Design an enzyme around this catalytic site. Structure first.
Site, PDB file in Angstrom:
ATOM      1  N   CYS A   1       5.989   7.082   9.221  1.00 19.28           N
ATOM      2  CA  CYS A   1       7.038   7.815   8.525  1.00 19.28           C
ATOM      3  C   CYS A   1       6.733   7.816   7.031  1.00 19.28           C
ATOM      4  CB  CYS A   1       8.409   7.204   8.820  1.00 19.28           C
ATOM      5  SG  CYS A   1       9.768   7.848   7.799  1.00 19.28           S
TER       6      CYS A   1
ATOM      7  N   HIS B   1       3.214   2.206   2.120  1.00 19.94           N
ATOM      8  CA  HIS B   1       3.488   2.727   3.460  1.00 19.94           C
ATOM      9  C   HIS B   1       4.743   2.070   4.026  1.00 19.94           C
ATOM     10  CE1 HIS B   1      -0.365   4.757   3.932  1.00 19.94           C
ATOM     11  NE2 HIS B   1      -0.917   3.719   3.295  1.00 19.94           N
TER      12      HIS B   1
ATOM     13  N   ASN C   1       0.807  -1.226   0.000  1.00 27.17           N
ATOM     14  CA  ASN C   1       0.000   0.000   0.000  1.00 27.17           C
ATOM     15  C   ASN C   1       0.848   1.288   0.000  1.00 27.17           C
ATOM     16  OD1 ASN C   1      -1.446  -1.940   2.500  1.00 27.17           O
ATOM     17  ND2 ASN C   1      -2.445  -1.781   0.506  1.00 27.17           N
TER      18      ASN C   1
END
Ligand SMILES: CC(=O)NCCc1c[nH]c2ccc(F)cc12
Ligand SMILES: CC(=O)NCCc1c[nH]c2ccc(F)cc12
Lengths: 265, 263
Positions: free
Chosen positions: B222, B187, B185
């Site tokens: 992050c 991330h 995804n």
């Protein structure tokens, strides 16, 4: 995994894991690169290795990768099984060549293939050297005698000369540092890390609208833990080609050079 | 892998790969962290998840708030390791996922892990700590009686983690995630933070000690365009206090503790 009936090649089946896939739910080129090195390690263990002979260990010699060429037609999806067949071949006094064939475990179709040129180097002084006769006699009993090429083609892209990227580069990824996960069991930067660093300079837009088909990567020098790398890319071209260069940020010493071919989705 | 007879936990066997081991020829803590994640994915798929129930309509996702991992023996390259996982209800606070790592030959427990999962809106990040009407949709996949991997009262998994005060004893600065550090995804996955926490541990400690315990509290994700700083201080066996913050602002993204034993 297991050796084929002739004992001249090794086969293994891998199931693609959740952490091994990218944005389009399929295995990444680094996951594929990892599976190729895992099947090579098991091929060496099955034929009686730990892949250096007793003579190579005696003389402090190791096998190093000089070129890695990977062509993918379809990337396996998360959950799919992929069967990889590998084998080595003697390329005279130059060194050896290891090939791979990736296949779909359900249909049996060839979804990818790879080749690599390995050279002999002194572990301590880093000086390369041509394979001696006594060394060649110990490996030949594990290689097919007749030529068996994954890339047989009359004009193949695996044996193409890679030029040096001239400055200024079109794209760049600066300040790349390897971590402990980027080291292998001998504390050296894994060769798969360089593949990731080469693709770091490819623009995100190219990644989102194209799929990686071919990747040829020439290895020149190893990167230490305390070294910082710079990734440079230039579009040399539905197909898109790029020229790549990896150099130490601290002096511009070349550690890698390559090419990638991408096609539209 | 497969669901147990009761359908209330999932088991899977993994063979440790060459690229998954460190200098001592055994699996790394990040390889273990990856195997825990992989067995959790297959447990969700086996019980009917393409993960997320009606939370798809409400734009709700499950996020990790705490990850606690204890290892006694790391599996060697070539060894098979069997992992059993299961989830449980922790009232309207959230869900807790546990693991048990075992040697496939001897059947001996070589490690164990636990995690606290919370419910968060994927768009606003608001985080609905409370939950109702959705507990019923999951309760049918969880054991009803308490089944804890870390049962002991006043244990290391439920310990409060303090904030590292400056100056830090050790530090690793300018850490940037690459595309391999992203999940399906885009991330930055919870395993990369484990690697970044151990980056500030001195090489000498790594070469003479083995990682036994690791508790890691997640505060903020992050981004790809973010740069992280890893800070460590010896609070002592050797214990360390850890902190991950954004290179510039000093915004906290993580905090933790690691316990190490002599070889
Ligand atoms: C990968 C590598 O080291 N290739 C050069 C040594 C070699 C020659 N024939 C082999 C057959 C099996 C094997 F495992 C290694 C070899
Ligand atoms: C924390 C977590 O793993 N996922 C939250 C959803 C969940 C609750 N109970 C389960 C039981 C099995 C399963 F696959 C998923 C679940």
């Amino acid at each position: 995994g297991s050796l084929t009936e002739d004992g001249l090649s090794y086969k293994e089946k891998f199931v693609v894991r959740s952490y091994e896939v990218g944005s389009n739910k399929t295995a990444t080129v680094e996951t594929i690169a990892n599976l190729l090195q895992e099947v090579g390690c098991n091929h060496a263990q099955s034929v009686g290795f730990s892949a250096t002979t007793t003579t190579m260990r005696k003389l402090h010699l190791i096998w190093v990768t000089a070129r890695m060429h990977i062509e993918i037609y379809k990337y396996p999806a998360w959950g799919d099984v992929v069967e990889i067949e590998t084998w080595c071949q003697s390329e005279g006094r130059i060194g050896t060549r290891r090939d791979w064939i990736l296949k779909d475990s359900v249909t049996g179709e060839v979804t990818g293939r790879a080749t690599s040129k390995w050279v002999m180097m002194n572990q301590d002084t880093r000086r390369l050297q041509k394979v001696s006769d006594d060394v060649r006699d110990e490996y030949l009993v594990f290689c097919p005698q007749e030529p068996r090429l994954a890339f047989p083609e009359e004009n193949n892209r695996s044996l193409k000369k890679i030029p040096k990227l001239e400055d200024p580069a079109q794209y760049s990824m600066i300040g790349l540092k390897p971590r402990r996960a980027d080291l292998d069991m001998n504390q050296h930067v894994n060769n798969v890390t360089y593949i990731g660093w080469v693709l770091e300079s490819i623009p995100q837009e190219i990644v989102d609208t194209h799929e990686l088909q071919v990747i040829t990567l020439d290895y020149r020098r190893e990167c230490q833990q305390d070294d910082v790398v710079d990734s440079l890319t230039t579009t040399t071209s539905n197909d898109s080609q790029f020229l790549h260069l990896l150099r130490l940020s601290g002096d511009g010493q070349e550690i890698n050079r390559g090419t990638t071919l991408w096609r539209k989705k």
